[PDB]
Structures are given as C-alpha cells and as structure tokens.
Amino acid sequence: LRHNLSIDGQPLSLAIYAEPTDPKALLTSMVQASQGGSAVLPGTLSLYR
Amino acid sequence: SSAIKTTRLAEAIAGIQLYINRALNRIEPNARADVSTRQFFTDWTVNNR
C-alpha cells in the first residue's frame, strides 16, 4: 500500500521508458599548408651556346 | 510514497474513519464511552464504509 503496488508487488504505475539521447555522427575536413621556394643559385656560365 | 493521489475530502474520510475506529476499539484512553453508544456507532458495521 505504501509503495502503491498490487497484492504481489507488481507496480500500479507503468515505468516510463526513458528513451535515450542516442549517438550522433562525426565529421572530418581537409587541412592545407604553404611553403616557399629555394634560393636561386647563380648558374655558372659555360662556354656553349 | 508520492505516487498515490487523493483528494482533501477523501483524506478527511480516511482520518475520520481511523479516529472513529480508534475511539471505538477502546485503545485510545479516556474515550467518551457515553457518547460512543449512539445509533451511528451501533450501526458502524454499515457506517464504516
């Protein structure tokens, strides 16, 4: 009587389902980087044409 | 528990019936046995519900 059950202890009020929050999806993206050139070496002038 | 729900008048019915039973069953001391011999208490078999 105190816990509001039946004669055999079965609950008189149906327990709520408590539907979960459920998982979510994941995402990824691209990443870039930048660089410069190398020092220009003075070409040793040959004799050819 | 908090699951049970009732009304003010129903709670008053419960309390008054319990008090009448306490007075009639001679467990509460200094009961007014002179008052307890009226028609209603004689017909308490059909007046308890």
From TrEMBL, chain B:
- Identify the domain of life: Bacteria
Q: Which residues of the full protein are shown?
A: 978 to 1026 of 2538
Q: What is this protein called?
A: XptA2 protein
